[PDB]
Amino acid sequence: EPEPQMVLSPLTSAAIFLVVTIDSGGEDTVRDLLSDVASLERAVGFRAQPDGRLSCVTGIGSEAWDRLFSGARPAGLHPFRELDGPVHRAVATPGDLLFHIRASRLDLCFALATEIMGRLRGAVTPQDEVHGFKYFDERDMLGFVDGTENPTGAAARRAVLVGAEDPAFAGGSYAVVQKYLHDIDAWEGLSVEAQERVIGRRKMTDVELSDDVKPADSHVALTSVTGPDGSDLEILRDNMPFGSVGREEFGTYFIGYARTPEVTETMLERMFLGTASAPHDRILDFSTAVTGSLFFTPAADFLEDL
Numbered sequence: 001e002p003e004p005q006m007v008l009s010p011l012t013s014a015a016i017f018l019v020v021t022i023d024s025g026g027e028d029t030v031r032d033l034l035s036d037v038a039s040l041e042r043a044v045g046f047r048a049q050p051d052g053r054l055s056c057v058t059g060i061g062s063e064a065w066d067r068l069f070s071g072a073r074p075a076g077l078h079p080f081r082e083l084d085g086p087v088h089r090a091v092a093t094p095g096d097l098l099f100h101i102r103a104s105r106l107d108l109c110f111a112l113a114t115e116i117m118g119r120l121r122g123a124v125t126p127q128d129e130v131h132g133f134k135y136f137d138e139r140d141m142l143g144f145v146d147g148t149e150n151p152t153g154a155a156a157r158r159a160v161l162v163g164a165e166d167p168a169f170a171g172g173s174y175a176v177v178q179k180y181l182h183d184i185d186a187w188e189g190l191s192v193e194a195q196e197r198v199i200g201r202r203k204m205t206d207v208e209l210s211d212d213v214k215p216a217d218s219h220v221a222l223t224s225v226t227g228p229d230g231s232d233l234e235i236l237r238d239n240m241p242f243g244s245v246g247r248e249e250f251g252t253y254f255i256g257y258a259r260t261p262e263v264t265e266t267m268l269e270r271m272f273l274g275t276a277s278a279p280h281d282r283i284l285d286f287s288t289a290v291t292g293s294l295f296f297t298p299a300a301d302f303l304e305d306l
């Protein structure tokens with residue numbers, strides 16, 4: 001019965017991440033926009049189907065939820081949890097609404113962002129806006145393939161969609177965003193083999209390092225999580241490169257979706273606070289988080305019915 005938003009998108013070479021705060025008294029304008037956001041997605045995207053692949057996933061933050069709605073809330077919806085590691089910090093930054101806009105073309109993303117922001121004029125203040133672009137063969141700004149071990153099909157739906165554990169919000173998901181900037185000069189001072197040690201995969205061929213070679217403080221080791229029952233705890237990432245050459249800004253826009261924030265926050269805790277065998281994730285020695293926000297992306301029928 002409950003239809004998910006397009007959390008599980010086919011691959012898209014362009015994206016706009018829009019994060020805004022809701023102004024005092026902007027709630028009615030926001031509720032009106034939420035009830036139309038699927039209609040606007042069809043209005044912009046339909047004429048470019050099937051290759052356009054335009055979608056918007058709309059998220060609401062914990063504080064914004066309690067300003068917009070009354071009664072029961074999604075069981076896991078809280079402000080992003082700031083992590084204060086001995087070396088690396090995951091900052092919490094303002095954000096009430098997320099529009100995760102993806103397509104095969106930036107123009108479609110741009111036109112939908114314009115229609116959305118057009119309707120929210122006078123009710124919201126811009127916080128963050130990133131225009132993301134596919135970078136060669138699905139690489140990120142560190143020169144590694146990014147997305148390889150994402151779950152797909154049924155395994156992806158089981159990892160990202162709320163079900164019987166929170167029935168009133170079935171078909172929703174939890175999105176965590178962090179905008180990362182990379183120290184490309186420091187990164188380029190490492191050999192390819194030193195970089196592979198940091199990530200935990202081979203750079204050109206994208207083959208995972210063997211169990212006896214993969215460092216405990218590699219990115220892949222610390223973001224590989226097995227639950228008590230033995231099965232892998234997974235998230236769905238759609239990381240997007242961005243930047244500005246004049247400002248020497250070379251970034252990764254991280255977005256991770258999970259059926260509970262506990263899986264994503266377990267990964268972040270291992271990365272920023274480490275484990276018995278790792279001080280922290282070596283990727284953070286080349287990567288600074290400058291935002292951090294958590295959102296609930298409800299079933300599409302929750303937004304339509306407002």
Ligand code: HEM
Pocket residue numbers: 140142144145146147148149150178180199201219220223224225235237239252254256264267268283287
């Ligand atoms: C800081 C910028 C980031 C970059 C540049 C980055 C890059 C990558 C790369 C290159 C891989 C290996 C290929 C793949 O399977 O996708 C990877 C894997 C992964 N990343 Fe990250 N990542 C970043 C942040 C994060 C964060 C913040 C999390 C979680 C909160 C995360 C979770 C994962 C997971 C779950 C995998 C799959 C590991 C596995 O099961 O094999 N990443 N990432």
Ligand SMILES: [Mg+2]
Pocket residue numbers: 138146147238239
């Ligand atoms: Mg990609």
Ligand SMILES: [Mg+2]
Pocket residue numbers: 183184185186248
């Ligand atoms: Mg530099």
Ligand SMILES: [Mg+2]
Pocket residue numbers: 149224
């Ligand atoms: Mg694995």
